[PDB]
Symmetry: D2
Subunit: 308 residues, 4 copies
Amino acid sequence: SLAPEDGSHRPAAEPTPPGAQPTAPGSLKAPDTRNEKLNSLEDVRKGSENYALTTNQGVRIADDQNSLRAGSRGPTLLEDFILREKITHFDHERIPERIVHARGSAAHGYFQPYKSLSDITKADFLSDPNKITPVFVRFSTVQGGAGSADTVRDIRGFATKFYTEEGIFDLVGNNTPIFFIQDAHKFPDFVHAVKPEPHWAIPQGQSAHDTFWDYVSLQPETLHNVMWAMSDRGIPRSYRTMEGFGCHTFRLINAEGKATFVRFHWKPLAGKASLVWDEAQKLTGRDPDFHRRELWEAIEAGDFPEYE
Amino acid sequence: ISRLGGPNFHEIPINRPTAPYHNFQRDGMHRMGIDTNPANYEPNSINDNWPRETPPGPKRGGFESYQERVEGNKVRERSPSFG
Amino acid sequence: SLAPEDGSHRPAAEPTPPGAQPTAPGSLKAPDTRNEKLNSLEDVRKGSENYALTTNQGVRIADDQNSLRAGSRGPTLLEDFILREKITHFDHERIPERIVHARGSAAHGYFQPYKSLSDITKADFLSDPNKITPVFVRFSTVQGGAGSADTVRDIRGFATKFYTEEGIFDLVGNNTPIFFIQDAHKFPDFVHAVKPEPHWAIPQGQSAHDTFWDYVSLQPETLHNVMWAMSDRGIPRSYRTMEGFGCHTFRLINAEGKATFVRFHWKPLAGKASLVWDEAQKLTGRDPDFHRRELWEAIEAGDFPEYELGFQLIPEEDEFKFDFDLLDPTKLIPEELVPVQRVGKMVLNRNPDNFFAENEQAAFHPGHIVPGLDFTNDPLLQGRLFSYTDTQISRLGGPNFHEIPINRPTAPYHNFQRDGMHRMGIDTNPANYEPNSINDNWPRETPPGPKRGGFESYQERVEGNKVRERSPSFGEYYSHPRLFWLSQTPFEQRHIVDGFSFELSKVVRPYIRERVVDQLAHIDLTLAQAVAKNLGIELTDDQLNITPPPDVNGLKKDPSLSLYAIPDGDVKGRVVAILLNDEVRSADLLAILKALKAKGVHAKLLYSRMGEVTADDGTVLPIAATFAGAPSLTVDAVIVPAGNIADIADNGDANYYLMEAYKHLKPIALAGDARKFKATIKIADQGEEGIVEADSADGSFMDELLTLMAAHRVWSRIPKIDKIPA
Amino acid sequence: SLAPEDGSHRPAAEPTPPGAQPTAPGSLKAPDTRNEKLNSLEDVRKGSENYALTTNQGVRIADDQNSLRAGSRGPTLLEDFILREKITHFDHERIPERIVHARGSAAHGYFQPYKSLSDITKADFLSDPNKITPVFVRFSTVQGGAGSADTVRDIRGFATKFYTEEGIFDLVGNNTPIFFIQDAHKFPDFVHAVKPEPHWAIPQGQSAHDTFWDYVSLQPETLHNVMWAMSDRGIPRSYRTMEGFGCHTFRLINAEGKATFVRFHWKPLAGKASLVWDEAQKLTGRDPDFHRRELWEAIEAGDFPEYELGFQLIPEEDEFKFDFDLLDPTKLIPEELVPVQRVGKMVLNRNPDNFFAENEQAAFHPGHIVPGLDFTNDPLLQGRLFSYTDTQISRLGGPNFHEIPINRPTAPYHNFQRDGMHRMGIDTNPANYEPNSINDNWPRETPPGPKRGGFESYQERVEGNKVRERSPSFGEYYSHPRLFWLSQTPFEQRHIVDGFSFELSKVVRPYIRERVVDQLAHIDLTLAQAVAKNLGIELTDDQLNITPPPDVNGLKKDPSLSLYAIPDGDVKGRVVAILLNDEVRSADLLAILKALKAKGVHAKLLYSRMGEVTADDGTVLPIAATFAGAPSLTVDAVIVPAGNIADIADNGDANYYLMEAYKHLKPIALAGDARKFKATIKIADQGEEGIVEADSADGSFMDELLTLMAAHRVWSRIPKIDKIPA
Ligand code: HDE
Ligand code: HDE
Ligand code: HDD
Ligand SMILES: [S]
Ligand SMILES: [S]
Ligand SMILES: [S]
């Protein structure tokens, strides 16, 4: 036994305020929280306590501190499959990050409509106020890599996967109601311009460089979303205190075949709040994980993020 | 790694062991297993070091190589006895 | 046409100081800087001026602003192949980042030896002072992703690809002489402990979390490299101002086949310099690209990064002459015991053209050796040899990663290997096997020899049983930490104390902090007490009584382990901030810039807005940045010239600038009415060592300033900064 | 030195007939055959002779016969990086095969138009008879894997990559003028039905199984292309002797902006020829590489595959003037209604160097069009446009597949796309977006125009609601099957009946057979009754009274649908087996061989063993193969010279050779005492059409034989083979 005798290594499995306990995986922190989706992931959840350490082929390992060598100061032997399996898995841990929105933080939850919307849409998840729909929601920035800072000035993404009884519906929104460009053919041009410049790969997490402002100056269509980004909207206090929008006109379709144009909104029930620029920027240095950390600690505290 | 697309090939259903498997390896493309262990390294105190090594023994023990004697120089050379 | 009339969109193709021009791809900035490797990449460089915009298939595009749709407000059509090809390429731009050292910055250069080393190695690139070897070097942090910050506290990588006439040699080193662990089998454990924790993926770029300190507390072999990381070694000022090390004992082999043990060193000709913790941390927010930018702009300016390659050489009969094992990569070889022989100089003189094609796709691997070099049984090196080949299969997409241009050897390569994903080479050999008769057995094996021979391993004797067992000779963990500790200046010691104290305070589980303090007590009681004090821990009686570890072969210190004990400062390439006012005394600025130019020291003119101000004699002075846009974090020293000081005297930003520079131990210089600023930093009328002040910026004023800059920081100021609110 | 001293290991670099020399990489066999694309590949071609064996990193290897081990009987060491590189590259050689057309054989050549087509298309490759366009052509089957057999019953692919000065144009066609299905959404259903069944992965290279015929029985739109596959079209003699078609209506666009609907044709200049089923099926066993081999050896011999490009052109005003919809890919356009206009000639004159690098990695896609061409709303074509770009992302590892050397345009290509796996091009452009001012907006869009203009889609009118709906105009399934059937000779019709019979006999569930027979009864009663008889199925009174579908625009046949109704034979490049005996009449063999050589017909001298035999006059005759080693399946005719016939008269293999060649309708010629073999194949004393016989191989003997060969097979023999035990 390496754990301290007083059990102070294990976080209390109950709501506790930020800083009071170490943070923990969700199913350990909050085992009593459930929904249909969380239940259905049980078949792949893997525990650990009281199990033997093995290879991926289920062979127990006796010594996980040393490679196999010819004498204790000798060369490592090619027949050490336990070493090569462990190093092979490590060697291939990384997958490509998202082209955009690479940096983001996610949580499980649920959604319920206030009333049946069957007069305007036949979407099953909106047909019955007792119908509860599990969700998984990822918030993100846009420009920076998966290892970039949270409190940058940037647009934020707000993507919700609804696991409905008639299929997955993903509402893939941002925290402003519009976008910089009109036609998708220009998306790699715009994204290239805001991303780090291609000779030297600078700057990270920032639109404050030549190519972004060149593109804007030559494409006045971008000005509307640029105003938003230059406002304090570009530096939210928390993912809990920003608005979400669906970006486009979509349609609702009812049982009768009637189409109604719709634009989607998320209203933060915690209200709207942003940082100020000097604060936001220094914070990318003092804690580049601030919004990720704040989201996780809100949920561990029972300060559940809520959106209408 | 190329044929089956990465290091999680043991999670492809035909290839899965029916014996238990638990270790500190993580991630890789199309990762199926969701690990709950607070720890992804050992030695650890935060999960009281689980999953744990197992001494070798008569049954249900850890793997240990037979301690064959090795004596020779580092050579790229075919044994004469093979000729 | 979109470019300005005046041509000010294009940077001059001549060396220019930082900030004077927009930065540019290296072949456009410095078209006449050449080496065999840069020249050999010409087949793949692609220009752009005067060419038509096309698909990848060579079809000219008429309208690159719109999708094809049925009516101008209609749906997009599936037959729009121009749109889909463009979006397809975009959708697939990213490749996996490196498992470790994902964050890094790279440059082209060359290496040349000081003399022939044929007496000790048959390595062709070391055979003649005339042999110029192109190199491509990538500097990196370790823990954070490719989009993490530069000035974190971390170990740094220092990887050099030598394009030799006898093959690629990759020297894949770090900025400290040892590693955290002894055996490669534990690498995934250590790296997972240091990396963001698996439930929530926090923290980025930091060792300051429970799992890292948990592992360290359970694995005392780590303590030596941990001492290095907690020192100011972990926060270098610049990739130009850090040491590099090969980490392991390798062998040199000569033409007679004699083996000599070797450890590799890179000595920075710009001297050793690091940041202080508060400045580094804040810098990760003000400019997370600081080291990448500083490297690129140093090369653009002509401040080429220079390093001397150094060998510590130990004869094979001396293997057991030290009181540590030469194969233990947690042990250093003190230079007092085995001096570094200076062997050649490397100069980085050209930036890449496309970061992703040349930097992100570069593959370095320490098993890439050439005849004249060989491995040892170091159990960390041993396992590295497996990892750096294997990891490229996913990262670079398959086994043809040597065909990616930056990776290609300039030496010939021919063999019977075929196919694999994105195979470039089209082999004409009728045979794809040997022995073969159908191509008269070509390409053919080559016997080992003094030059241009095939590779043969040194015939080391191996005797022992097949065991998974750590050598008993590796079982000593505290004497090297202690040697390092005792070799640091008293201010370097204070910063080590602060680094442990700061990191451990971020460990939420108190027993982990307690266990680390117990390990410190095994190294040095004074260290352990100072850390404990900052954590509100009291040493027990047993801990007060642990006997110190032995000296290292009679050594009770080695000043070569200190960044600063032996003076080594070089001011060329450093930068000063000059805080302007709306009517600067022009005679101050003439002298300041004059004397800074003569020592190669750069300047940034700063003010409260952009544009220009005008000096007292009508000289127009362009403003580089605001006080808040280019903080003192980014400069080595601050000068305030005389003039209308009332203009800035009550500027919060201007006052803070000097407070922050003051707190970070930087030289400050104040002329005439600028001495009014002494009051913001609490300087007595009589002055203070590290504050330069005079009636005007005359000749003696700049000499004293440049003297301070050669010594990097004003360490004597440390007891004054505690009271300053900054 | 392992090569023979006599140099007989190396083939002559001159054209040589099949079998005379070992085959070789194209650039070694025919170094002086050149075109712009072959020249442009020189940067990646890697030789071998006189070069040292190295790692991929350029390190010379001394011992490529052994792993590094501790002792010559000890364990292999992880530090053996030479072993691990070599085995790593091997371990990763394979890439995914193509989802369909995985089996294919390719060659280089060139195309030239007969005259400028500027009045109907601005396509630069068709603008000038003196403009030569390099091509790379891949022929394929459809269902089987890359390691399946060539002479299966299947559709064939005929894909041509034109490396034009205004971009790559890929004409991705098949050997029949229609496809099985109407809408691309159904392509996975169709392909899955014909592919090996998913429980057990059987059968390979065959539509003869339940699921294919299930799908056909339930999707009558398939019946037209099924008629083609069941005919001898499904079993070509050679890729040189099949037609090619572009499958869909596309558009030509001229400089004035006029659109003309076009379907593409390739006419084989060597004539149309196919195998017979028993032969084709047995050949998949005796030489599953028979078409790949035949192609490669045709090119080595100088019998270059030549095709004439032709267009069926239909003016925009005539879109609705046929009984069938022009956009329906299950309908052909009969040449009687719309003739093929000759456009130009393609010659395939050089084999690749490395099959993997050039053939396996080639990417063809029908969306790769150039200005002067455009698409139509054909709903199969429309979905193809999505598939051929998407699939390369796994098959070829990413979006940089255009940088794989065979796939590169010879036209310039420049744009703002960056990165992706395997990125080769190092872009120096300061900008990676447009519009940009920092590179003066280069590379720039180009307006459309008469030559060298940007691509702009033809402004076709679209009007309709968003629907998933098949056009009513596509709802007719039997008239084209019937047009095809009525156009075939009586022997061809017989082979169609036998194809359906054979296939349906492999369908295990009898109801599926019954349902297919019911569909046949909607096409033609005679066809339906004959298949029914072979399956032991009796048509119902209702089936016997189904009224036949209408003629196609008044056509009751179109002879251009037949392989054979209009003679188009060409003996050049065909091959004859010559059955030797141990004392051949040398005067017969001189006459035979020289007559064959004069018409470009090859010969293979066969016997009961390898080595030599000696003619009557002492001439030493080298043996190419044994009777069993090179069966009659692989030749077009058989000649037996006179001499010591008793030597082989009783050889079972020699007799069976004649029986097999007899059954498969091949010309046979017997000189002098070789006429004793008449008894083996049952020929009357007075002789029969299709058997050449005389006292000696002089006079008209060889002319009569060549006349038979010009007509390909002896169809009149069909009633005679019915009862031959062979
Ligand atoms: C309206 C909200 C919004 C808008 C207007 C866009 N994004 Fe997003 N994006 C991808 C492509 C893409 C395109 C082509 C366009 C306009 C043409 C937009 N974006 C604008 C993507 C490259 O396919 C993307 C990256 C990886 C991926 O799977 O999808 C992508 C990301 C993305 C996210 C992140 C989703 C997540 O995993 O958290 C969000 C919230 C948006 N986009 C919103 C969005
Ligand atoms: C008209 C000639 C023709 C037709 C009508 C089709 N094929 Fe082909 N094919 C692919 C997909 C595809 C679709 C989606 C459809 C109708 C919707 C067709 N086919 C019918 C493919 C999966 O994208 C394919 C496989 C790998 C690849 O790169 O493309 C593909 C191959 C193919 C070839 C082989 C070209 C070559 O690589 O040698 C040929 C000659 C055809 N198709 C013809 C074709
Ligand atoms: C057994 C696993 C292992 C071990 C024990 C080490 N390494 Fe490593 N290293 C890798 C496995 C690895 C790697 C996973 O293979 C990387 C990341 C991806 C890459 O291409 O190689 C790598 C990258 C990497 C780089 C960056 C190369 C680049 O810039 O692209 C450097 C500088 C080092 N390593 C240096 C070291 C040092 C100084 C070590 C101790 C002295 C060390 N490595 C131990
Ligand atoms: S949007
Ligand atoms: S190391
Ligand atoms: S087709």
